[PDB]
TrEMBL record, chain B:
Family affiliation: Belongs to the tpcK family.
GO molecular function: oxidoreductase activity
Organism per entry: Cercospora sp. JNU001
SUPFAM superfamilies the UniProt entry points to: Dimeric alpha+beta barrel (SSF54909)
A Pfam family assignment: EthD
Domain of life: Eukaryota
Highest classification ranks of the organism: Eukaryota, Fungi, Dikarya, Ascomycota, Pezizomycotina
Domain EthD per the UniProt entry, residue ranges: 13-110
Identification of the protein by name: CTB10
Amino acid sequence: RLLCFSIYVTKKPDQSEEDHHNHVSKVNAPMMIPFLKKYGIVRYTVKHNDAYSKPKQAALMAGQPEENVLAYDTVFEMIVKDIESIQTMQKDEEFLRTAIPDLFNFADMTRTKGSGTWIEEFTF
Amino acid sequence: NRLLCFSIYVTKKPDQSEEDHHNHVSKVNAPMMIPFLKKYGIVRYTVKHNDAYSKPKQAALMAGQPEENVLAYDTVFEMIVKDIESIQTMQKDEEFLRTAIPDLFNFADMTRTKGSGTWIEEFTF
């Protein structure tokens, strides 16, 4: 059974949505990727809710009341075989001085939410 | 060329056991869904379970977080597609309307479903 760690990010207050998502894709992702590789993350997914995706979300959610649109600026998902992979990553000396301070440059750190699940996956 | 993701956040049917909910989802709903997902070109389908098996792992990951920060639904479905017309056509397929749609009422609280639509980046190692 594979597990999934989901991180639901509200963008830094005052930060443009364009600045937020550019930082996430162009700076945070290449910062993250070496740690994810080193600690055996199977899959990493970054989900963006911005001007580009919003009309598609509005079409998919047509006929739903707005409070049914569970919308965060960015959602990260890490799929792993064991949560110890993630906990060891997060305490990695280098992680604490790179990925952790970078959070304050794109996330409202008073509002983050998360979940841990077991998953089934299908590809075609 | 950006992939899109449709996320469906499901609260279990009132009075349904966690065990019954997740067995129905994995064993009945998934094989019901898989042919439609294939036919309509969904790239990836992910079913995320929050039950007795995952809960101590989530408690460990979320250690030190206030309970209201644990955004927890019973089941989360994610469909990754090249464009949303794939999904909308699937959902209006007459066979979908008499199989997948009624099956929702046998495992989901249909007054409480939430969703989102996002564009995604994906990495494998």
